[PDB]
């Protein structure tokens, strides 16, 4: 039971650390995206650098 209790505590600690890493990854992927960045290069048309996707 003690070995089980220490293993469960370690599992919860590792899960919290993994969840925090996933949270920071989510924050970075939405900060660096297109909806929440207003990149002027979203309008890079495939027809050339003179046209834009309207």
């Amino acid at each position: 039971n003690k070995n089980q209790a220490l293993e469960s505590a370690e599992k919860k600690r590792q899960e919290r650390k993994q969840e925090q890493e996933d949270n920071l990854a989510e924050i970075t992927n939405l900060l660096r995206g297109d909806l929440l960045s207003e990149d002027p290069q979203q309008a890079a048309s495939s027809f050339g650098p003179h046209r834009v996707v309207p």
Binding site: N1, K2, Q4, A5
Partner: protein, 433 residues
């Protein structure tokens, strides 16, 4: 010789199966692949293809591919014979109807065919354990068609059912009420005993006892497995008072259409809470009757116990059982009906509950009780209210009558269940003559 064909039907059934089959494989040794890493106890659940492969004796059925297609790509891809896993290319859409009249009677053929093969390789079928969900297409529809068709072939052979009764408050569906009432109607003369387990209660058990503040099906599912492995523990291990799968019927279902036993595992404690309890035969027995360690949200004091089946396992001295059972009878709260004095089918196996890399702790003793209380009347009545609450404006019924269910079957259903509510009353009043 003590075989038990097990049909799992629906996300619920198939997913509870993952848990049940894990526990079975980590107890008998059968490794995830299908070979016991370098003696005949597995013949109650697995087989032997004269080579060293131990194939499960089961048919997992789900009209939706997603679920079963993760068991044919997971760490058990081999154990299950490809065929056993049977799927379809379209769900039932939470519509009992499209599971008992349309996209469901198109797979009864294949399933009954497989049930036959797995049953012709048995030298003593003890019964068919069916795991489903009272709410849901395949869980209600297919289970209904299956139970019926089974009766036509396998005559009066036991057909014990394990189920997730519609919860008293949560309920992840607006149509749950309809499916649950229609199910009982079709399966009220075709089911021998139907063990019940509600998610709302297992959630509570998984917070006041297991300290998992955030339960996930995997947790709840595994707890239900320990129950199935206790109901089927005397058929593969030794004991002092064994219990078969054809005895729960003649020791829990009192009058005809009253087969709804509730389940309760006693030592559902956590590692950091077992370093404080002696978990003794007495302690665990009183725990099963405590109106909190129950598993079908329904206060047992709101009714009267009709019959009990305490299935024990571990270091349980036969005399400590007599002691505890006696002390329970003395207490008043636990009120047993008058027409049932002897109200305890006691059974004691020896294999100490197996610990699966999971949540529950390493306990030496355990007791899984099966009660047929008349307090399940409130459950049937709450479900009944919801059926009416919507059947008045004929709500969500176009979906059912546009597949093959005459709208009148809803009335025949409500009527049948009204008799059941009234039945649960007559079999509770005590003769004063």
């Amino acid at each position: 010789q003590r075989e038990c064909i097990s049909v799992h039907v629906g996300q619920a059934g198939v997913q509870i199966g993952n848990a049940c089959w894990e526990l079975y494989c980590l107890e008998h040794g059968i490794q995830p692949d299908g070979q016991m890493p370098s003696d005949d106890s597995f013949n109650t659940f697995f087989s032997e293809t004269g080579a060293g492969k131990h194939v499960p004796r089961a048919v997992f059925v789900d009209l939706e591919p997603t679920v079963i297609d993760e068991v044919r790509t997971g760490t058990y891809r081999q154990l299950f014979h490809p065929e056993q896993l049977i799927t379809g290319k379209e769900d039932a859409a939470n519509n009992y109807a499209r599971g008992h009249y349309t996209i469901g009677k198109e797979l009864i053929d294949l399933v009954l065919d497989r049930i036959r093969k797995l049953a012709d390789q048995c030298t003593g079928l003890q019964g068919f354990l069916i795991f489903h969900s009272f709410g849901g297409g395949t869980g209600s529809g297919f289970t209904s068609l299956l139970m019926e068709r089974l009766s036509v072939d396998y005559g009066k052979k036991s057909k014990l059912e394990f189920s997730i009764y519609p919860a008293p408050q949560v309920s992840t569906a607006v149509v749950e009420p309809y499916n649950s009432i229609l199910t009982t109607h079709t399966t009220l003369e075709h089911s021998d005993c139907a063990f019940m387990v509600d998610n709302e209660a297992i959630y509570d058990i998984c917070r006041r006892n297991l300290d998992i503040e955030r339960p996930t099906y995997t947790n709840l599912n595994r707890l239900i497995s320990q129950i199935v492995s206790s109901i089927t523990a005397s058929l593969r291990f030794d004991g002092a008072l064994n219990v078969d799968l054809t005895e729960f019927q003649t020791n829990l279902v009192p009058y005809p259409r009253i087969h709804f036993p509730l389940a309760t595992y006693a030592p559902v404690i956590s590692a950091e809470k077992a370093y404080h309890e002696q978990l003794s035969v007495a302690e665990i027995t009183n725990a099963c009757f405590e109106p909190a360690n129950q598993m079908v949200k329904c206060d047992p004091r709101h009714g009267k116990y009709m019959a009990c089946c305490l299935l024990y396992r571990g270091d349980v001295v036969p005399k400590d059982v007599n002691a505890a059972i006696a002390a329970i009878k003395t207490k008043r709260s636990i009120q047993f009906v008058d027409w049932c004095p002897t109200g305890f089918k006691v059974g004691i196996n020896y294999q100490p509950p197996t610990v699966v890399p999971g949540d529950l702790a390493k306990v030496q003793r355990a007791v899984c009780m099966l009660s047929n209380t008349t307090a399940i009347a409130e459950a049937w009545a709450r479900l009944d209210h919801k059926f009416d609450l919507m059947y008045a404006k004929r709500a969500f019924v176009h979906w059912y009558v546009g597949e093959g269910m005459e709208e009148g079957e809803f009335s025949e259903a409500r009527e049948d269940m009204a008799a059941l509510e009234k039945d649960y009353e007559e079999v509770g009043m005590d003769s004063v003559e």
